[PDB]
């Protein structure tokens, strides 16, 4: 489910901090990410956070919603 | 006439008892759903129910096949005890794995076959499971207080709960079987007691008593009749005409108030000074009891008498000329006290032996109706546990256990009935599955693991899903009675067949 | 089945939909309602609290609305516009999280949880004010005055109260204090400068002519019994055919009632107070007026009130006969007083009654039928509200600006709780600050821009501050003068979670047959 | 186009799937129902089969997920030889009980998880169902009849059935200690009996010359050569093109003549009296060879004439890149002989006796072709039945055997995964409720039967779909090979498997 292995997470941050310890990625009864072996580049992940933000930042930009009916030929 | 085919009648058949197996099954098990039931079609209010009695009878019936049921359900529920719910809900689950086998095309008598020697093999199942707790009485005295602390919870109390555990288990034990509720009356009162109820030592009686008849009696003698005028006595010289011009309307109403001094001279003879007539007179007569010296107590309740016979010998029977046809009852003193805020002429002189009053403090009029409900499905249980001290771990862990042991001779037994056997198992775990997302687990997966656990041999481990999680039963205490579950089992795989075997409906 | 999915977003819609257009709440907003009624008849309304205790409504979800007024009105007597508003807050959560696949039990929990944690943060930011001092319940009392319509009437009010409730009074801060015991009656005639407070027991009832006792030592009478006199209850052999012999049998019948009414003052009566009931007619129409003669009060066909005030505060129990003469199980008197001023007006006063250490009676004057109305009003909501701080004291912020506050310091505790339900509550939190927003929405054209906006400038005074809800500006909410008692934010919020929890819980449809 | 969201995605691939395992629960076994093949597109004629396999290529299919059940069909053809429409209504049947899951609440992950353990289990229980059988030669000639009846009448032949599979046991008895199919040549030719059928012992090419040239060696000597006469292999005694006159057509032709004759002669000289060519032999190369004393066989078949080269103990030229100076293969006797109404050319005496030549004798080209077909899937599942030389009991009594470890097992777990294993167990079982209408015997009384055998602990009796009652199987000629059965279930499962993972079908048509 969905919502209960998140629920499981979110109680080892408070807990403890910079986890070693995130959802199963093994498809795993236990829940770790150093027993899952999954690791991303530090740099990898910030990349990520810089990209979602940008498609906001772009979609933003001028106010030119008038089409004439030509906008995604 | 009208005609509904083979096909048809077997489809609303099975979502009838299907849509009306939904709203008991909410309540029923650990706490999970509920229902509020909503009235606009009689009258437009809402309703907070717990008990499956009110639910399925209050709603009504149209559906040929939901009408059986409903009414074999509601008179297991007296019997036997949370009945209501139990009975109405496995057997609609087993109507919906009908609904499977015949599109696929198996008869309909190896389904009906198919679940009943599966009945008979959970049965049997449940027999093993059960093992005794009541083998010193002080211990049966706590197996008593699970199956009590059980019933009571997943219906709506507030307080009343906690006093009713032990209360029931008192009662029922010290009687031993039978009815209880000769062994404790339910007396239903408002008052300054928010959701407290307490034993009473006497009967007491809701009316206040007022002018010239005295409050206090001392050395009370009870002559006992159930009968007595309305408020007016007809007799050999209490028949009058007086009427017949317009006038004459207010002297034949001179007339009656006469007819009411007669009667007080009846008992007068007797010499017995407290006459107790269970129907209400108005203020007006009371006047002449009260000043002849032969004290009328009127509105009085035969439940509460019949306290006060059993300890000192009276006889509660009609018919009264002289005191030696019906036999006396004893009380010192019958004084008026004020119990809540509401004033209550209360006789006091004997305690219990072969019956308690129970009175009940609220402060509306719900609470009380739906705490003795509560309350007698609970004793229903309690008197089954006397003769038969087995006990076995339900709040689902039971079902499943049953259900592994049909699903096992589901396989080996049968040469065509194998597909209906496991049918049956399956609808057993219906139950503990729709109780699971109400607590927060995951369905699929408490039903497919601790089954094999407990059918190996840890039974105490069963189902607690108030939290949706595994906890011991015999020390969290969601453990009932052997007796209770075994018939309300062979009711609803009665029913379900009942209603599975009728493939043409007639209407004339 | 689909019975259980679509029965609870239809319920949800249709109760929050109607708490959209109710929720114009506090100052002037919104536009009037002339009503053309499914009957015929028009309509005027005004007042958000009168309205909703009126409100007439056949959708199961929504009577929940009438009736959460009504409980409110009791307990706390003050925010009772106020928990309707906060619990279509709590109907918005339950569809966001329907989407998420949090299971609508999950929902109810959630409740309890978001109760238990926000109650006790309300009793954190609180001062104590002690609820047997005066000063601090004067101040208070000046503050939902001046939120009525009184702000001139006011001055008079203030003080009466805090005497009033003061007699009721029980020391803890446990439940005690009511308007079982608080007898509210109106009065044609006096002033809201001549109201009056009398410590003990008065009842309201109509009174036959001017001319009667105005002084002290009575025997207070609570009678069940109608007389005998001839064509009465008494034998005549006397039939009438006749106009003439009419007036024999209705002459020796007033006659006879002339010596009775006698024996009832022997006793000592000077009130004396007839039953609801008939038992025939009850005392007779020709009995009243020679009761009047003997100086002795009456009221036949009494109001429901009177019988259980008489009863319980001065023990007062029904009387024999007069023929057979009475029981004497009345109560003590002391006071039979004929209320007239400025020409008008009929009351019984009860003074040196016997008492249970409760029960005050304020008594209501206006010199018109409007002006009556004007005071009872305002006077209710200031007696409440120091009421309330003996259930259960302290000052909050008022206005229900605190719900506002409260969801700040809410969101945290939900994050740190990390549960299923704290997703739930954190939900919960963002929907209090909607409602200064959603009050004004309506009104007007334009809306989003000041919707974002008085969220803004409320969060960012901290725990402490935020803009005011009787004033507008960023400046001390905690007290100022927009206060209100504990007892009334936490009963809202409390009245609140139980009804909208119960939408969740049902399944399938259901209609009694 | 079209971005199909995760659910309406599995509704498609389910149908799909579906709409497929009808045709081939229908096809399957021996008593199996037909399929009509309709050629759509393009006219709308029609023949009748029961190959579940011809079903998929013939009549193709544009739902994705359906895609997926085309292309694991084709792996059962070559490799395994039968179990082309066993696999096929097994996937469908998975799928089927992973509907009801994905409703529930349950994801795809759940359902793929649990059913990758219950595989391995179900494997464990393949090898507990196959008892050895044949490795004696008495026994191993019971052990391959079994298999090879089974297969044919699955792919449509059960006639003329019973002659073959005498034929094709006996070829792969030669052997021993090994699965060659490399020596054991299948040939189906025109003319003969549709009763009669030949297996010669050696080598036979069906390829003949006429009675014009010689066919009477006794003592031969086998060259084995790939040589242009007019394709023009390497070893040019020729000319190249060119054009300088309006005379040069003449030109050509006389220089081809020089070139073949030239070519005769250095295939002279190797000294041998049986020359075998894959290409043309043109009318002047043959009349010098019928001269020279060399037999001439042209347009023999590539593999046929390179699988010749291994068993006479020859070797092959190779483009002709060997025109003197490549080894002899050898035989005792070439003797011309009339088998049917055929002229055959019989090598006998054969160096390797393992080689041997199975000859299909139609009389309808209709029976010829799909007999030709349905016989290879067999012979490739008795090569592989030589490496491990034993069966699982056939007929509905492994797959409830399957089941039914994979239920003991579902029982024990409480998991994510013991979902999906009620699953596996009733998809493996409903398979021999197929068999079942394919007998033509109510489904209910004889599943429910064999299920309650094999948790007790048999084997020892399986569905006779040929009897209409449960019966035993004690290795009779109802049995299917463990061989078979293994890849079978393996990749059914895989396929199913796919088809839950993909539900981001993006459709761009």
Known sequence: NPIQTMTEVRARQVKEMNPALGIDCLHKGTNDMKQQHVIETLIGKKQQISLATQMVRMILKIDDIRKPGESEE | ADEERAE??????????????????????????????????????????????????????????????????????????????????????????????????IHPQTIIAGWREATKAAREALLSSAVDHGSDEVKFRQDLMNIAGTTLSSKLLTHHKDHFTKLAVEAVLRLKGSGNLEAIHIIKKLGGSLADSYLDEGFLLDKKIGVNQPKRIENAKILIANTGMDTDKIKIFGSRVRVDSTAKVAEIEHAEKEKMKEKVERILKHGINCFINRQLIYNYPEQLFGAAGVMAIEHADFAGVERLALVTGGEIASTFDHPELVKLGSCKLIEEVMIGEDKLIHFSGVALGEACTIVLRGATQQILDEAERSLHDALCVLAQTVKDSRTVYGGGCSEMLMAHAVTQLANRTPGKEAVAMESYAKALRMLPTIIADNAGYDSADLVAQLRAAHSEGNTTAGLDMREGTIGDMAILGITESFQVKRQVLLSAAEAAEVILRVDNIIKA | RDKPAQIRFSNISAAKAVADAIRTSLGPKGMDKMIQDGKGDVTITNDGATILKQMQVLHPAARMLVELSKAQDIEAGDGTTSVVIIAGSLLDSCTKLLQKGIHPTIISESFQKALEKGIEILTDMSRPVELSDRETLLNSATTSLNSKVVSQYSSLLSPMSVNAVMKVIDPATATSVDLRDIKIVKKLGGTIDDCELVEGLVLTQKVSNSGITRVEKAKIGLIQFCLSAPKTDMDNQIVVSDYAQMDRVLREERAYILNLVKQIKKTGCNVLLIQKSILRDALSDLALHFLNKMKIMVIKDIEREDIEFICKTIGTKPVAHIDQFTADMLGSAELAEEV????????????????????????????????????????????????????????????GAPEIELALRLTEYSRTLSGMESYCVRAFADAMEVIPSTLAENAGLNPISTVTELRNRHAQGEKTAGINVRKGGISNILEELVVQPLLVSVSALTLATETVRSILKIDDVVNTR
Do not use: W, Y
Not at chain 2, 80 to 103: F, K, N
């Open chain 2, 8 to 105: 048809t009648a077997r489809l609303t058949s099975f979502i009838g008892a299907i849509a009306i197996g939904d709203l008991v099954k909410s309540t029923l098990g650990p706490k999970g759903m509920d229902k509020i039931l909503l009235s606009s079609g009689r009258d437009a209010s809402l309703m907070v129910t717990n008990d499956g009695a009110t639910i399925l009878k209050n709603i009504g019936v149209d559906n040929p096949a939901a009408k059986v049921l409903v009414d074999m359900s509601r008179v297991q529920d007296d019997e036997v005890g949370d009945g209501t719910t139990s009975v109405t809900v496995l057997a609609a689950e087993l109507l919906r794995e009908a609904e499977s086998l015949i599109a696929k095309k």
């Open chain 3, 340 to 399: 007239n001023l400025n020409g008008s007006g009929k009351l019984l006063k009860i003074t040196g009654c016997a008492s249970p250490g409760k029960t005050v009676t304020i008594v209501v004057r206006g010199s018109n039928k409007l002006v009556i109305e004007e005071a009872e009003r305002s006077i209710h909501d200031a007696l409440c509200v120091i009421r309330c701080l003996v259930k259960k004291r302290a000052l909050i912020a008022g206005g």
